[PDB]
Design a binder for this molecule. Structure first.
Ligand code: CUO
Lengths: 69, 70, 208
C-alpha cells in the first residue's frame, strides 16, 4: 500500500533522492493532459478562469480578500 | 527556531510594550499593487513607515475586508 | 473482545511470517497446566485437555470458535501492518514502568515535569495513565519486563527533546481513592527508540 500521510518538510533540507523524485513526479505531472494535470490544476487559481457565476460571467476561482482564503 | 510553547512566550513579550498602529481598509483595486507609506512630522521630515502588497488582477472576485489591516 | 484481539495479533504474526502458534518466551510457564481447568471441578473436558497454554494458541478447531472478522478498527490485517510501519517512522521516546503490582487495583497517572516555567509549559500532568487490576487474593506477580508507554507526543508538545532534562512524576491512587506510597515503587525509566537510521555524532568521528 502506498498510503499514510505525506510529509511536507523544509526545502533547504533537500535530500537528493527526495529532490529527484519530486522533479520527476513534477515532470510527469506537467506532461499529463488529464484533468489531474499540471495545466488543469493551475487553471484553478485563475487563468483560464474556472468559475462560473450564475450570470455566466467567468472569474478567477481563488478566494482572496476573504476569510475563506 | 522556536517551539510552540516558546513562540507563545515570545509573542506575549511583544504584548507587554505599547505600540502604535496604522490601519488600512482594503478593497479590490482591480489589480496587483505595492503600497508604501511614510510617517512624516510637521517639519516634513519623513521616514519609511512600511510596505504591504495586494495580489489581484482582472476578473478577480470582488472582496473587501471586514476589518482593518494593522 | 480481548481474546479476539489476541487472535488478531496471532494472524498478524503470520503476516509477518512469524510462527502463529509459537511462543519462544516463558517456555516454562507455557507447559504448566492452567488450574482450575486442570481439576475435576471443571466438567468441561475440552478445557481440561486445553489446560496447557501452549495448546491454547490455536483456538481454531481446538476451541471450535471463530470470530466474524479479525480486524481492528475496521482495518484489514494487511492494513494494520501498513499502519504499524508508519508509526515506526518517527522516533519515539517511552517511559517504562516496572510493575510489581501488589495490593488492590489502582490507577496511576504520570507526566514529565520540566524544570522551568517561563515560556515552557508547566507540568502537563498528563503523560498518560494505566491501571492495574488486582486484589488481596491475587498471587504475587511481577512483570519480567518493563511496560512501555509512548510519551513522545506529549514531550514534543511541551517542546522537550529526548535529551532535555525532565523528571517524571507519578501518582498512584487506589480505587478507594487512598493515596499509595510512591516511594516503594521504583521510578520509571525513559527509553528512546529509533529506527535503523540513527543519528551520527557531532563530537567524535564514527568512520575511520
Ligand atoms: O495567490 Cu491566490 O494567493 Cu497566493
Amino acid at each position: 500500500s502506498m498510503a499514510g500521510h505525506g510529509v511536507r518538510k523544509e526545502i533547504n533540507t533537500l535530500t537528493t533522492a527526495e529532490v529527484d523524485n519530486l522533479k520527476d513526479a513534477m515532470r510527469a505531472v506537467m506532461a499529463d493532459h488529464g484533468p489531474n494535470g499540471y495545466q488543469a490544476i493551475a487553471a484553478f487559481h485563475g487563468n483560464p478562469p474556472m468559475c462560473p457565476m450564475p450570470d455566466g460571467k467567468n472569474y478567477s476561482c481563488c478566494t482572496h480578500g476573504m476569510a475563506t482564503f | 527556531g522556536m517551539t510552540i510553547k516558546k513562540l507563545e512566550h515570545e509573542l506575549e513579550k511583544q504584548k507587554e510594550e505599547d505600540r502604535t498602529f496604522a490601519a488600512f481598509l482594503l478593497h479590490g483595486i482591480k489589480k496587483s499593487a505595492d503600497v508604501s507609506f511614510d510617517v512624516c512630522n510637521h517639519d516634513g521630515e519623513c521616514h519609511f513607515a512600511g510596505t504591504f502588497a495586494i495580489l489581484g488582477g482582472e476578473h478577480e472576485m470582488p472582496w473587501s475586508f471586514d476589518r482593518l489591516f494593522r | 473482545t480481548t481474546d479476539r484481539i489476541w487472535a488478531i495479533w496471532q494472524d498478524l504474526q503470520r503476516f509477518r511470517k512469524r510462527p502463529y502458534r509459537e511462543a519462544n518466551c516463558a517456555i516454562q510457564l507455557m507447559h504448566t497446566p492452567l488450574q482450575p481447568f486442570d481439576k475435576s471441578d471443571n466438567n468441561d473436558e475440552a478445557t481440561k485437555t486445553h489446560a496447557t497454554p501452549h495448546d491454547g494458541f490455536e483456538y481454531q478447531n481446538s476451541f471450535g470458535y471463530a470470530y466474524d472478522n479479525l480486524e481492528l478498527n475496521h482495518y484489514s490485517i494487511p492494513q494494520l501492518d501498513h499502519m504499524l510501519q508508519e508509526r515506526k517512522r518517527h522516533d519515539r521516546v517511552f517511559a517504562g514502568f516496572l510493575l510489581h503490582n501488589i495490593g488492590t487495583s489502582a490507577d496511576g497517572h504520570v507526566f514529565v515535569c520540566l524544570p522551568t516555567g517561563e515560556h515552557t509549559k508547566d507540568c502537563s500532568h498528563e503523560a498518560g495513565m494505566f491501571s492495574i487490576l488486582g486484589g488481596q487474593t491475587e498471587m504475587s506477580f511481577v512483570f519480567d519486563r518493563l511496560y512501555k508507554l509512548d510519551i513522545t507526543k506529549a514531550l514534543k508538545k511541551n517542546g522537550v527533546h529526548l535529551q532535555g532534562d525532565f523528571d517524571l512524576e507519578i501518582e498512584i491512587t487506589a480505587v478507594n481513592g487512598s493515596h499509595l506510597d510512591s516511594h516503594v515503587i521504583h521510578s520509571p525509566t525513559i527509553l528512546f527508540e529509533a529506527g535503523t537510521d540513527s543519528a551520527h555524532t557531532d563530537d567524535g568521528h564514527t568512520e575511520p
